[PDB]
Amino acid sequence: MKVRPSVKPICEKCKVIKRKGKVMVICENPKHKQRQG
Amino acid sequence: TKGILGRKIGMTQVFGENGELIPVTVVEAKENVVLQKKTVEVDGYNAIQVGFEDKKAYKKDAKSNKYANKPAEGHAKKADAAPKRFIREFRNVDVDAYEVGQEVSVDTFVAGDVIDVTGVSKGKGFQGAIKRHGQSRGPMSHGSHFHRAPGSVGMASDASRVFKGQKMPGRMGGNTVTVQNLEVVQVDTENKVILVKGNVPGPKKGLVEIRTSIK
Amino acid sequence: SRVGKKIIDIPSDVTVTFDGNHVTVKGPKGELSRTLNERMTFKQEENTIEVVRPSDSKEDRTNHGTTRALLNNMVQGVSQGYVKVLELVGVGYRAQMQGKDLILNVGYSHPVEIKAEENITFSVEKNTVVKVEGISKEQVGALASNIRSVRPPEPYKGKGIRYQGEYVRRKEGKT
Amino acid sequence: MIQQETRLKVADNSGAREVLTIKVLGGSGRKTANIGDVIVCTVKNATPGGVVKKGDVVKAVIVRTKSGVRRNDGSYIKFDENACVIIRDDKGPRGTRIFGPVARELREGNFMKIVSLAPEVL
RNA sequence: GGGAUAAGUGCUGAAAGCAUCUAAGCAUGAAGCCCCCCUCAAGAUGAGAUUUCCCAACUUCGGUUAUAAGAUCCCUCAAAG
RNA sequence: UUGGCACCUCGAUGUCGGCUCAUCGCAUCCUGGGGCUGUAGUCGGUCCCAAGGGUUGGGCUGUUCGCCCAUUAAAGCGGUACGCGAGCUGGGUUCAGAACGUCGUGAGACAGUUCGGUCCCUAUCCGUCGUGGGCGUAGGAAAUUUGAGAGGAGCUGUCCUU
RNA sequence: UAUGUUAAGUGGAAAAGGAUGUGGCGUUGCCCAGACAACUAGGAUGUUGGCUUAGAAGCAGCCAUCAUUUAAAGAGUGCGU
Ligand SMILES: CC[C@H]1OC(=O)[C@H](C)[C@@H](OC(=O)NCCCOCCC#Cc2ccc3c(=O)c(C(=O)O)cn(C)c3c2)[C@H](C)[C@@H](O[C@@H]2O[C@H](C)C[C@H](N(C)C)[C@H]2O)[C@](C)(OC)C[C@@H](C)C(=O)[C@H](C)[C@H]2NC(=O)O[C@@]21C
Numbered sequence: 001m002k003v004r005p006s007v008k009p010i011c012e013k014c015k016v017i018k019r020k021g022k023v024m025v026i027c028e029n030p031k032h033k034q035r036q037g
Numbered sequence: 038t039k040g041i042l043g044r045k046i047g048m049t050q051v052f053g054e055n056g057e058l059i060p061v062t063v064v065e066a067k068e069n070v071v072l073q074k075k076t077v078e079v080d081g082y083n084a085i086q087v088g089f090e091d092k093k094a095y096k097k098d099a100k101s102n103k104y105a106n107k108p109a110e111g112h113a114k115k116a117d118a119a120p121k122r123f124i125r126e127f128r129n130v131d132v133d134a135y136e137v138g139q140e141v142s143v144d145t146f147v148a149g150d151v152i153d154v155t156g157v158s159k160g161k162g163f164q165g166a167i168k169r170h171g172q173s174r175g176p177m178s179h180g181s182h183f184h185r186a187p188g189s190v191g192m193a194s195d196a197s198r199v200f201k202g203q204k205m206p207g208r209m210g211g212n213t214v215t216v217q218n219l220e221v222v223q224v225d226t227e228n229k230v231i232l233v234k235g236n237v238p239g240p241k242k243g244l245v246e247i248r249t250s251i252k
Numbered sequence: 253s254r255v256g257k258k259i260i261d262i263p264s265d266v267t268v269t270f271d272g273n274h275v276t277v278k279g280p281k282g283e284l285s286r287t288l289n290e291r292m293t294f295k296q297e298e299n300t301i302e303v304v305r306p307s308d309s310k311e312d313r314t315n316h317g318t319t320r321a322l323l324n325n326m327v328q329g330v331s332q333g334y335v336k337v338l339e340l341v342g343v344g345y346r347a348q349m350q351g352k353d354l355i356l357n358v359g360y361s362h363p364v365e366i367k368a369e370e371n372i373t374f375s376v377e378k379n380t381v382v383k384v385e386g387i388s389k390e391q392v393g394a395l396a397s398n399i400r401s402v403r404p405p406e407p408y409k410g411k412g413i414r415y416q417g418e419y420v421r422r423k424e425g426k427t
Numbered sequence: 428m429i430q431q432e433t434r435l436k437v438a439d440n441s442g443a444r445e446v447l448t449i450k451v452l453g454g455s456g457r458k459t460a461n462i463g464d465v466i467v468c469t470v471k472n473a474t475p476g477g478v479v480k481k482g483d484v485v486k487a488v489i490v491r492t493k494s495g496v497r498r499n500d501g502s503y504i505k506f507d508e509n510a511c512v513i514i515r516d517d518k519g520p521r522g523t524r525i526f527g528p529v530a531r532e533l534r535e536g537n538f539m540k541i542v543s544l545a546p547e548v549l
Numbered sequence: 550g551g552g553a554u555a556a557g558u559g560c561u562g563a564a565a566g567c568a569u570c571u572a573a574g575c576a577u578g579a580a581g582c583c584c585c586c587c588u589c590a591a592g593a594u595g596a597g598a599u600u601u602c603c604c605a606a607c608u609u610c611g612g613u614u615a616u617a618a619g620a621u622c623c624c625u626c627a628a629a630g
Numbered sequence: 631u632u633g634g635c636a637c638c639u640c641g642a643u644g645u646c647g648g649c650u651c652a653u654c655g656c657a658u659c660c661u662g663g664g665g666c667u668g669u670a671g672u673c674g675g676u677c678c679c680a681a682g683g684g685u686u687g688g689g690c691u692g693u694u695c696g697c698c699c700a701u702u703a704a705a706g707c708g709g710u711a712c713g714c715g716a717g718c719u720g721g722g723u724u725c726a727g728a729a730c731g732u733c734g735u736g737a738g739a740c741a742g743u744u745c746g747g748u749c750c751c752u753a754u755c756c757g758u759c760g761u762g763g764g765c766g767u768a769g770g771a772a773a774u775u776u777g778a779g780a781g782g783a784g785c786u787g788u789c790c791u792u
Numbered sequence: 793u794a795u796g797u798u799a800a801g802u803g804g805a806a807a808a809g810g811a812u813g814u815g816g817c818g819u820u821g822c823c824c825a826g827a828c829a830a831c832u833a834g835g836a837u838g839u840u841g842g843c844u845u846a847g848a849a850g851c852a853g854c855c856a857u858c859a860u861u862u863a864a865a866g867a868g869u870g871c872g873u
Pocket residue numbers: 642644725749750
């Protein structure tokens with residue numbers, strides 16, 4: 001889980017979602033899971 | 038589950054089954070009587086009050102706690118008992134297994150229970166920071182003038198005050214202490230004595246409140 | 253909301269009792285009872301039920317389609333049932349029953365026992381394929397997750413309780 | 428009660444005739460030790476020859492002390508001198524004999540070669 | 550050993566007929582939070598509760614003696630100082 | 631932290647280390663929970679949640695620091711007048727003596743060394759640790775009490791088994 | 793009082809940057825011939841042809857990237873070495 005003030009898609013399969021207030025990216029590559037931003 | 042009022046007699050030793058030295062305290066529980074049965078709807082919490090020892094009866098012109106006063110005679114006569122010296126109550130007990138007026142006997146305890154003995158500590162009187170609080174004291178040489186007093190009591194201008202709880206000199210002792218997870222080695226029904234492995238708080242001739250471990 | 257408005261529901265040999273808010277669906281396999289959204293209203297024609305939003309507001313819309321699919325799930329489930337299949341892969345990894353409870357042997361130096369609940373039933377197959385079944389989709393989902401959390405799949409040999417047909421990303425760590 | 432900067436006699440033919448200790452293994456802040464406890468130490472008097480030589484740092488086990496030990500029955504065993512034996516990091520001695528009595532409590536610590544190569548277990 | 554949680558993990562689920570931990574709801578999850586365990590605690594001026602003991606007789610009207618029940622003075626003491 | 635400014639203090643706010651006693655933050659050293667990994671488990675690295683507790687003994691210097699020797703699960707970083715001298719020391723530094731090197735024609739000088747060099751105070755108030763008396767709790771009393779609150783604990787190793 | 797805005801206690805401390813948070817005003821390319829979803833409907837051909845490179849035929853790199861079996865098709869939009 002990366003927590004970086006900059007959450008943005010890393011791959012094309014990358015979806016930005018807003019969960020519980022935080023802009024996160026959930027992707028099928030667990031490496032591309034991101035949290036804050 | 039079980040509870041008995043007793044007093045501490047001393048310590049001795051017993052030898053165990055495999056030869057082990059067992060350290061023990063002799064406690065004397067005699068004529069423990071239930072005097073009330075507190076109930077939830079009558080008093081708000083269910084429990085029972087036990088009176089221990091035996092005072093003498095009321096006399097006119099008494100000058101000591103040896104004899105009962107009129108107020109206490111009445112409380113004990115409602116349980117058809119003699120005036121007693123020490124009165125405590127127990128909550129862990131099932132109030133319905135006791136009756137106002139029964140004797141609580143030493144045999145309530147079997148060998149190998151787990152009990153908590155709650156007494157009062159021995160008085161050490163006014164003491165200082167090294168005995169009362171375990172503080173390391175200062176150097177005794179090398180030109181020191183700080184032998185046993187406590188050190189700094191605070192900081193400086195920030196908190197221009199001493200904080201609550203600063204460990205300073207004063208009276209030591211006279212505190213209720215509960216040692217936990219002791220056990221009984223033997224119960225003697227004729228001399229009325231419950232022997233408890235280990236050591237318990239208090240002066241000799243004191244008072245201990247033995248009941249069943251809450252853990 | 254397309255899900256909500258467009259897709260009309262289809263009561264099939266079941267009894268959708270829309271008692272004000274609290275609905276009560278029954279059929280072949282049992283009864284399910286939920287309280288749906290207040291502001292929403294429902295129009296039950298013959299063998300069809302339809303959900304309508306009060307406004308075109310985001311709230312009314314996000315809620316609209318949500319509890320239009322929560323009715324379908326109830327009626328589709330009290331009639332045809334909902335089941336989840338879990339497989340167990342691994343030398344010595346087993347699956348066995350014990351009075352409607354499920355003992356699992358997944359290499360944990362201790363047997364793990366999942367106790368079952370109301371309206372829910374477990375079953376095994378060849379000591380590997382567990383199957384959770386019931387009428388609520390959110391009980392079959394909750395339990396099947398609880399029984400996969402015992403040992404979820406691992407990335408190196410896939411060993412663990414996997415959902416039947418679930419891509420386990422397999423790494424190739426070597427010695 | 429053995430603490431650091433305590434000189435002990437060696438009861439073995441390792442070469443070391445007398446040694447002193449630095450630490451007592453077994454815990455942060457551990458300060459003392461008794462029979463059956465291991466200590467780090469540096470010899471101060473060696474025999475001419477021997478496998479262990481002067482100024483080395485070595486593991487070692489206490490075999491007899493003047494403070495002595497309580498046993499579970501209320502029996503106490505005390506001695507007239509501190510003593511120690513060097514070990515090879517396997518609870519085994521460095522020398523081939525062992526001089527003087529030894530306390531029975533070393534049996535438990537699995538210092539069995541120390542208990543087997545001993546004049547008197549006690 | 551309970552109860553509520555943190556990062557996290559989910560379940561059902563739409564806005565956005567797909568998805569999706571989220572918005573409704575409902576789960577799980579830490580030496581952390583609350584309880585649990587030890588001690589002090591009704592000056593808790595909100596001053597709480599239970600049992601018992603004491604209960605008259607002058608007033609000229611109590612702004613009333615002295616006495617109960619209970620203590621203390623004083624004295625022998627220490628398990629307390 | 632090294633500074634810049636000169637705003638309170640020169641009818642005096644003792645300045646450095648150490649000792650005694652701590653207390654608080656968390657950007658966490660260990661312990662607990664996790665996402666990961668170029669993680670097969672032990673391994674390590676990274677990031678997140680976490681401050682409840684814990685977070686050694688020595689050799690060398692007046693030293694803080696740092697290095698070294700043994701350990702530990704870890705040997706955390708900071709604030710607190712670089713916490714704390716009306717609680718302690720006084721080794722360093724900063725009076726008068728002396729001496730060496732250097733500068734000065736000289737008296738003398740150097741933040742260059744070196745040996746020596748008086749640490750006062752009976753606690754009024756607030757504060758804090760204990761311990762009494764008075765009064766109030768719609769009568770006067772003896773005993774047993776619930777608990778609104780408050781405080782204390784809160785750490786963790788190795789071995790065996792599977 | 794009227795009409796609107798926020799959902800963060802924003803109001804009631806920062807910034808470069810990051811974001812399917814939400815409201816307004818335009819501009820716009822597409823759409824009942826039916827754009828946009830997963831619309832679970834076909835997905836490959838001589839053919840990696842040529843340099844074919846560790847052999848490697850959507851990956852170590854020049855791409856020469858020909859028409860369509862076809863309602864819709866690319867010497868493969870593409871996840872891969
Ligand atoms: C016994 C009772 C008397 O107390 C005292 O002597 C105590 C001991 C004294 O403590 C101290 O020395 N400092 C604490 C120790 C500091 O070590 C560091 C190393 C040094 C030095 C040094 C430097 C220069 C000179 C100097 O140049 C020179 C010369 O000759 O020129 C003479 N030397 C000696 C110097 C030595 C008091 C307390 C002292 O005050 C303090 O001095 C400082 C000026 C300021 C202090 N603060 C403001 C920071 C202050 O607190 C006084 C001056 O005493 C001399 C107190 C005055 C009032 C008195 O006179 C009283 C009446 C004393 N007289 C007497 O008889 O009773 C006394 C109470």
